Design a binder for these strands. Sequence first.
RNA 1: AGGAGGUAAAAAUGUUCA
RNA 2: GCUUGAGUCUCGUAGAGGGGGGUAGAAUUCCAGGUGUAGCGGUGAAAUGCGUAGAGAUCUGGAGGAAUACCGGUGGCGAAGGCGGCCCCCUGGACGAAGACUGACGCUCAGGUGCGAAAGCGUGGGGAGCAAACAGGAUUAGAUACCCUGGUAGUCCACGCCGUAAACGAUGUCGACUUGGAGGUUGUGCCCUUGAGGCGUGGCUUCCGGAGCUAACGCGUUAAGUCGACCGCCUGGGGAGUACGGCCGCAAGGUUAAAACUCAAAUGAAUUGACGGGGGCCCGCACAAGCGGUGGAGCAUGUGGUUUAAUUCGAUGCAACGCG
Lengths: 151, 65, 65, 116
Amino acid sequence: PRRRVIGQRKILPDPKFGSELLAKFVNILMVDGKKSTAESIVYSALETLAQRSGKSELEAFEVALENVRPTVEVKSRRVGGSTYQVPVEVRPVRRNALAMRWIVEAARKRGDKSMALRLANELSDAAENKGTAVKKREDVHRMAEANKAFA
Amino acid sequence: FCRFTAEGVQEIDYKDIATLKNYITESGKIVPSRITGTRAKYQRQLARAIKRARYLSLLPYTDRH
Amino acid sequence: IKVRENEPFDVALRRFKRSCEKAGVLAEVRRREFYEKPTTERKRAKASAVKRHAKKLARENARRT
Amino acid sequence: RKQVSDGVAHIHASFNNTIVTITDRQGNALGWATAGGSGFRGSRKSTPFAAQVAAERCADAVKEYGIKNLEVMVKGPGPGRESTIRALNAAGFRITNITDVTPIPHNGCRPPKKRR
RNA sequence: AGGAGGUAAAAAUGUUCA
RNA sequence: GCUUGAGUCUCGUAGAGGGGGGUAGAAUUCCAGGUGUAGCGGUGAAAUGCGUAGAGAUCUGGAGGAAUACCGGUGGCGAAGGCGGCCCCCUGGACGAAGACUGACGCUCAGGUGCGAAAGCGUGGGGAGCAAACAGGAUUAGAUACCCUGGUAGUCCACGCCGUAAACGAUGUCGACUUGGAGGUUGUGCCCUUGAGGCGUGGCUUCCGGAGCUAACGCGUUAAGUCGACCGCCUGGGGAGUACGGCCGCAAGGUUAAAACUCAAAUGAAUUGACGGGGGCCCGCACAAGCGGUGGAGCAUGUGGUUUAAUUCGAUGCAACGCG
């Protein structure tokens, strides 16, 4: 806001293992306040990812997260004249947060059967970083590096 | 802050490039009186001399030859 | 005008540029002839300058800082 | 080819562009690069970052001449002027001396009145 | 404390009277 | 007749004061040649334009015209307009110094004469840059404007004309007197130059302010203060600084200068608000960052419109429209 610089809230970790990164991922997925369904979805998408990768459950997630994790984004900070696009670095707490949202919205696309299966398909396709979710990352970089004349 | 011939009466000479170079910057530009603390009267005599010395090429019109 | 330093510089440090001309007069003959406006901005220049020093010798109100 | 050793970089940094030209000591041009040649059209043309890539694209394209060390004589105000000499030094060239040759007249001609 | 470089393309009109 | 009015002589001082003739460097454009290569230029963006016939950039040389960076400063000089690179020649005025000299020759001044920015005009030159007009490209609802690319007169020189400007400290000229402070600038006297000086005595000038004055703002020893001398000018707004006539002008016009008619106001300064595509600071789901929706469908429901014998009446920017 204008003057309010109050701190954030502390979220609880997922009820399978201590990993608040995954718990945050559940909430981004959750709609209409249905968290019970949300965690059931990501857990099923976790084993289906682990069996389709041969890795562990949590480590198969980061190797699909830092592939869709951006480092620079576009902010519209004007100079007084035209409000031109300006590339700015991203804070770490927003880094993975922006990444998790992208893979979720990609799951809303590419309708296979169920989104539990679908996001598992996107997390697997993010492993070889050649999906539509990772596509969002490069295009953000495509307008960043191609317009990194402002600093 | 510093003075000149106002107390030690004498005249400025266009030939004396020893002291004339002390009143201009190395880039061939005359320094204002607000910095050298020169009396307004002598600054005029100074400037006339600098311009005469430049004509006789004893001083640079500009350092970029 | 010609900064060198010769051997241990590794950087620009061309302070003379911000200290001589290279911006003031170049961005002055950039456009606008005026022929007369210099005079009004001549008088306004020190009109602001003399009123700043008048209150510099009159800032002793209290202000409680 | 002819293999020259020493040269001088001419940097014409004006308000819209920053055309960089590397010549030899006698004045004969060897290679050049501009901000508007490496893409960067429009508002991004008059930018110090564009001057960076202008220096980089001029850093090469003169490889066949193999210039060891060179001088820099910048000209004009421009948004670059000091960011372009940085990319030219960090490129791998030895900068001996930097000079400023901005052409200021002694009230020669009547400049424009434009821009209202 | 002392001086400079940089900061807005386009937006017309409003019945008379109280 | 006398001297404090005014003027003259002797010696110096500072100065873009004025006229004429030469001269210098930076820079812009252009011309020729070498190197070299896809852009250059421009703008908020873009296009016209320039460029592969090889531009721009860069280097050397040459040809021109205009203006004189830094010095340069609410500094200086001039009646005002106005005037600045440097040099020489012709020449005006102001100011100080210690004396002599003339002896009211002084002040103002209708008519009259002269000078009088810029633009404009006539004759002959010159023409780089800039630039009315004009052209094209854009912007835009339109854009014969603002912006961009070009560009003629003009801007510059000699000789004549015009005689007007917010020709403005908006303040007529001359003289006298009336508390101070802080600076600049230009002479001079005295004391120890005993060290970047100190105290006086004049010219000019900037800013701040007391008495007083003023409608107020403000002016304030260069007065809009206190008086005297002379001249010009005003008499509500509009009509109108126009018409008619005269004088002047090559012309554009200038100058002198009404009336009818029409309004009951026009106007000045200052005050409180509101307002500004003014400034500064601050706040709110105002924006931003996100989440979920409306507007598309069906339908419940309210309103308008139309129909109807009647579709009771009211609410109808935000702040009416599942409201009474």
